[PDB]
Amino acid sequence: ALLQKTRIINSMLQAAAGKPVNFKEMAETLRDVIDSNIFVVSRRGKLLGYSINQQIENDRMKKMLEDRQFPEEYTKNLFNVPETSSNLDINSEYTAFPVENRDLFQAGLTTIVPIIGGGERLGTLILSRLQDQFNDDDLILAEYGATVVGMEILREKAEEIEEEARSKAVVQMAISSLSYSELEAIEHIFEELDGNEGLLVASKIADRVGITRSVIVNALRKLESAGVIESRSLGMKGTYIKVLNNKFLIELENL
Amino acid sequence: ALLQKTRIINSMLQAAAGKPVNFKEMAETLRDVIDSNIFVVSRRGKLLGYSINQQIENDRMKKMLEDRQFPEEYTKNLFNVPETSSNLDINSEYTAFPVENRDLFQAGLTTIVPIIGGGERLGTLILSRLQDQFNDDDLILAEYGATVVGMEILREKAEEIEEEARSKAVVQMAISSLSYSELEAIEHIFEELDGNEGLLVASKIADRVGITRSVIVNALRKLESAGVIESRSLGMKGTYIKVLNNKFLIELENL
């Protein structure tokens, strides 16, 4: 039924497709397929997701869960595990962890799989059982699992930078197309405006600043047509604006 | 030794990391691990890579290889296989292929794994053997294999459109910065130039066309400053230019 088991993980990957990464979800699916407690811990050792199907009396663990994080101590110790290590209990004679960190295997069997992707140690996958051995098939699953979670940390962060940069880009591209006086205007406007939103009299700034209303508006138009702001007038004696690009205001500061 | 077999795939993936996707290589690695002929065919049914370890008398396939492509016929039929289909020979009674495409199984055992990733059917992985059956362990590997190829087809195509676009984008942005006269100049320059490279006398076009050297120059500057072209003079009685943006010439046409 192993083929089938891997097939699940396959479909769970295929499923997460266009949808924001959910670690808790993945944690569960693994928990189910491999039949073990599942813990997903970042490079920096932060707890990213987890799922439990058997209670295991472990202080260090419970504390870590409460903390949603590992102490630097362990975090490092963990990162230093270079490859899958399996079936570690408190009796395990081995290298990976120094004596005073063995409280991690206080009870039950633990397996450590590094999460590697995009040529980086991305984090670590922790599995624990009360007493059932991790045989090879388990390991296969666990490893495939970690591999998949890898690809998600990647998708996750990749999506992240694409947004950040794209938005910034667009702002710049828009700003670029401003005349001196247009930009001059925009600057004065948001110098005047009280953050993300608010309204002002276009025709008033025009006098106050020494720039035709016609261009002030024009400038607004450009920003709007690039989708950075949203503007609606109120039969003048008012015109109102909200920014729709979170990077915009910051970028504007940089000049 | 299955675990080990998967682990190869694993490190093959991890290996491809920062390096340009190569399908022939992956083909080989899978050929090796699965112990079967491997062919990687796109959504559009193009041949992407392949590797052979055993000769099989199959005209349809030899033909396909020569063509580096399938006929729309098969391409379609292939795409319609919704999930892994295994050990299909000429005698197989089943649904997947209409009997006029049976010539596909002319000889030996064929197995088809759809390549799915990022929520799309990305292509198809085809494996063939002269007579050894595909057991589950093979299918696990073959499927893990397809999966890996997946994220690569993705990466490859993604990188592809990121370059295409970015180039185009920057051309436009640079064009955007030009005066009527400046642009007019550019246009006559490349109308005069014979493709990607060559030289002319700036001062000559100036009279020929009715635009000051001074601006013709400055137009070139602008382009260069944006990294579109590369310009070096030769103490006049010559100035020389090379386009560094493959999209630029094309875009220019579109005006």
Author numbering:
A (entry chain H), B (entry chain A): 2 to 256
What does the study report here?
We have solved the structure of unliganded CodY in three different crystal forms containing 14 (form A), 10 (form B), and 2 (form C) molecules in the asymmetric unit from data sets extending to 4.6, 3.0, and 3.7 Å spacing, respectively. The following descriptions relate to the structure of the form B crystals, because these crystals diffracted to the highest resolution (3.0 Å). The full-length CodY protomer has an elongated structure that spans 80 Å in the longest dimension with a dumb-bell shape. The 12 residues (156–167) that link the previously reported GAF and wHTH domain structures are in an α-helical conformation. They extend helix α5 in the GAF domain and connect it to what was previously named helix α6 in the wHTH domain, thereby creating a single α-helix spanning residues 137–177. Within the CodY chain, there are no non-covalent interactions between the domains that exist as discrete entities. Examination of the molecular packing in the crystals of unliganded CodY reveals that the basic building block of all three crystals is a tetramer. The GAF domains exist as two pairs of dimers flanking four wHTH domains. To facilitate comparison, we superimposed the wHTH domains of one of the chains (chain A) of unliganded CodY and Ile-bound CodY(L3S) onto one of the corresponding domains of QsrR, FadR, and IscR in their DNA complexes and observed the juxtaposition of the recognition helix in the partner wHTH domains and the DNA. This simple modeling suggests that the unliganded CodY dimer, in which the recognition helices from each chain are related by a 25 Å translation and a 40° rotation, could bind to a DNA duplex of ∼20 bp.
